Design a protein around this ligand. Sequence first.
Ligand SMILES: [Mg+2]
Ligand SMILES: [Mg+2]
Ligand SMILES: [Mg+2]
Ligand SMILES: [Mg+2]
Length: 86
Amino acid sequence: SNYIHIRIQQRNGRKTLTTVQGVPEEYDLKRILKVLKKDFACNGNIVKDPEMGEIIQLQGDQRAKVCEFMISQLGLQKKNIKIHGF
RNA sequence: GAAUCUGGUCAAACUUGGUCAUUUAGAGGAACUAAAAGUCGUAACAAGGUUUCCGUAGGUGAACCUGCGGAAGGAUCAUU
Ligand SMILES: [Mg+2]
Ligand SMILES: [Mg+2]
Ligand SMILES: [Mg+2]
Ligand SMILES: [Mg+2]
């Protein structure tokens, strides 16, 4: 219930994927993704992991930025928005 | 011939408005360099992995991409 998980997938040594999973489907994804792209200056994607967790994919270790964005916009509590160190 | 006074006259100045320039405030806004063990890509240099470039229009994390027409500064100085 409301568990939004941010998870780093390390690809090639230092080059990384910030995968944000479980974002609410009331305010649409595309706009949010675009905003993130503008802010992060890094590429973002929409991933459909076996139709259970819809993922906003981002490039690079900018989890802090994601957190900040959440605080600004939709992630109100910072309790059910969880961070993986990996 | 003294103050004084009518008309001029040159007219400082003063109240007005509007031009300008030196300036310093400049709420905020976008730039640019210098720093070059941040972040993401890798665009260009090799046919640099879609050859690059120009002019232009559109698009968009960002290098940029794509139309259309030109260049080669091309990777062709070549067909009885
Ligand atoms: Mg080729
Ligand atoms: Mg390249
Ligand atoms: Mg190339
Ligand atoms: Mg030259």
